[PDB]
Design an enzyme around this catalytic site. Structure first.
Site, PDB file in Angstrom:
ATOM      1  N   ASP A   1       1.270   6.812  14.892  1.00 24.19           N
ATOM      2  CA  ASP A   1       0.226   5.945  14.348  1.00 24.19           C
ATOM      3  C   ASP A   1       0.352   4.531  14.913  1.00 24.19           C
ATOM      4  O   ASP A   1       0.334   3.539  14.179  1.00 24.19           O
ATOM      5  CB  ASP A   1       0.259   5.939  12.820  1.00 24.19           C
ATOM      6  CG  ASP A   1      -0.934   5.210  12.201  1.00 24.19           C
ATOM      7  OD1 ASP A   1      -2.002   5.134  12.864  1.00 24.19           O
ATOM      8  OD2 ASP A   1      -0.783   4.697  11.064  1.00 24.19           O
TER       9      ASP A   1
ATOM     10  N   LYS B   1      11.062  -4.214   3.384  1.00 22.36           N
ATOM     11  CA  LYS B   1      10.249  -3.093   2.920  1.00 22.36           C
ATOM     12  C   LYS B   1      10.854  -2.571   1.628  1.00 22.36           C
ATOM     13  O   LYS B   1      12.054  -2.281   1.576  1.00 22.36           O
ATOM     14  CB  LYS B   1      10.206  -1.993   3.982  1.00 22.36           C
ATOM     15  CG  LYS B   1       9.372  -0.750   3.585  1.00 22.36           C
ATOM     16  CD  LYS B   1       9.641   0.455   4.514  1.00 22.36           C
ATOM     17  CE  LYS B   1       9.037   0.314   5.927  1.00 22.36           C
ATOM     18  NZ  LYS B   1       7.556   0.477   5.922  1.00 22.36           N
TER      19      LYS B   1
ATOM     20  N   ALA C   1       4.778   1.617  -0.625  1.00 17.33           N
ATOM     21  CA  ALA C   1       5.539   0.515  -0.058  1.00 17.33           C
ATOM     22  C   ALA C   1       4.943  -0.852  -0.371  1.00 17.33           C
ATOM     23  O   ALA C   1       3.741  -1.011  -0.613  1.00 17.33           O
ATOM     24  CB  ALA C   1       5.648   0.641   1.470  1.00 17.33           C
TER      25      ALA C   1
ATOM     26  N   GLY D   1       0.832  -1.188   0.000  1.00 18.48           N
ATOM     27  CA  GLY D   1       0.000   0.000   0.000  1.00 18.48           C
ATOM     28  C   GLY D   1       0.868   1.239   0.000  1.00 18.48           C
ATOM     29  O   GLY D   1       2.060   1.183   0.314  1.00 18.48           O
TER      30      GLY D   1
END
Ligand SMILES: O=C1COc2ccc(-c3cnc4ccccn34)nc2N1C[C@H]1CCCCCN1
Ligand SMILES: [Cl-]
Length: 321
Positions: A129, A36, A19, A16
């Site tokens: 987050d 990643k 990435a 998403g």
């Protein structure tokens, strides 16, 4: 099978924003990793420089409950970040499948979570987050927090992300247009996390963002009949509407619930040990792979995040069948 550097690329774990993250195997040691992958061709110069600043943060976060960086591989078009693999996946999925954790199990995870976040706050790094989808679980069910230091566009995202994070974990000061960058916003999110671990559900929710926004701003949530008094009292130190009336994590580390069963082992700020870069057993193994002793010392002492550093660190992790 596709490779990158010393790594065989395997199945995609998530995708998403800018990435992708794939499981992979380090060919030289056999260790599993997560990689990643960021396509740099999608970024402008400003965002590319932001990405590199955030990678430099990842390089200095070394905590047992934070996903560790092992290697950076960079091509003209692509950035690869080789990281720890947490083989039991997301806390989100675990709670969906198995339901709420008993308070003893939740406490073990939450001590790790609080230690990891407090450690980053020491360095004035705020996650911004924290959510069930980036609390991961290793093979022994230890917490590994993902994406610490990274902005949302360099993560694969969670299911409900809006305004660059997961709304059910967003502190109330964000919905009032107030400042959104100090440790207090993580402290609120940690209260939401504790509630979800112990109850299996979110304390604030809604069919749409406007409904959720009003629930968060009102600050009221249901206490399940099975929740202990001490757990409820700990939640009161996180889920405070006025940010300066929230506990700090260093104070919360002294809480009764978080130390129940740890009376001779009170939770305290993490102290990072110095890295042993002189393990002759691993050095001899790497010489057998064709590395020289002098280049091992150079790469480790300068912490280069090259193929030598990665191999040494991966040899320090237990293998897995
Ligand atoms: O979306 C999925 C699907 O389920 C998974 C299972 C395992 C892993 C995983 C295991 N080890 C690592 C190391 C780094 C990053 C991810 N993982 N990830 C996932 N994610 C990605 C995960 C990244 C954090 C942002 C929010 C979404 N969660
Ligand atoms: Cl393989």
């Amino acid at each position: 099978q596709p490779h990158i550097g010393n790594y065989r690329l395997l199945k995609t774990l998530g995708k998403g924003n800018f990435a992708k993250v794939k499981r992979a195997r380090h060919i030289l040691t056999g260790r599993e990793v997560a990689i990643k992958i960021i396509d740099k061709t999608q970024l402008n110069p400003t965002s590319l420089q932001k990405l590199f600043r955030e990678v430099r943060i990842m390089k200095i976060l070394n905590h047992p409950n934070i996903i560790k960086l092992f290697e950076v591989i960079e091509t003209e078009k692509t950035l690869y970040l080789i990281m720890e693999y947490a083989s039991k996946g997301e806390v989100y999925d675990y709670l969906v499948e198995h339901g709420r954790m008993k308070e003893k199990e939740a406490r073990s995870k939450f001590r790790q979570i609080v230690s990891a976040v407090q450690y980053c706050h020491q360095k004035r790094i705020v996650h911004r987050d924290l959510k069930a989808e980036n609390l991961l679980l290793d093979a022994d069910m230890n917490i590994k927090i993902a994406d610490f230091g990274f902005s949302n566009e360099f993560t694969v995202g969670g299911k409900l992300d809006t305004f660059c994070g997961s709304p059910p974990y967003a502190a109330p000061e964000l919905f009032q247009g107030k400042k959104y960058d100090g440790p207090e916003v993580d402290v609120w999110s940690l209260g939401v996390i504790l509630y979800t671990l112990v109850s299996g559900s979110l304390p604030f929710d809604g069919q749409n963002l406007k409904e959720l926004r009003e629930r968060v701003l009102r600050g009221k949530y249901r206490i399940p009949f099975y929740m202990s008094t001490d757990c409820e009292n700990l939640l009161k130190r996180f889920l405070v509407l006025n940010p300066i009336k929230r506990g700090t994590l260093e104070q919360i580390m002294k809480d009764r619930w978080i130390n129940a069963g740890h009376e001779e082992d009170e939770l305290k700020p993490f102290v990072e040990p110095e890295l042993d870069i002189s393990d002759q057993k691993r050095i001899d193994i790497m010489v057998g792979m064709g590395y020289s002793q002098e280049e091992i010392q150079e790469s480790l002492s300068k912490m280069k995040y090259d193929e030598i550093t990665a191999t040494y660190l991966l040899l320090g992790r237990k293998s897995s069948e």
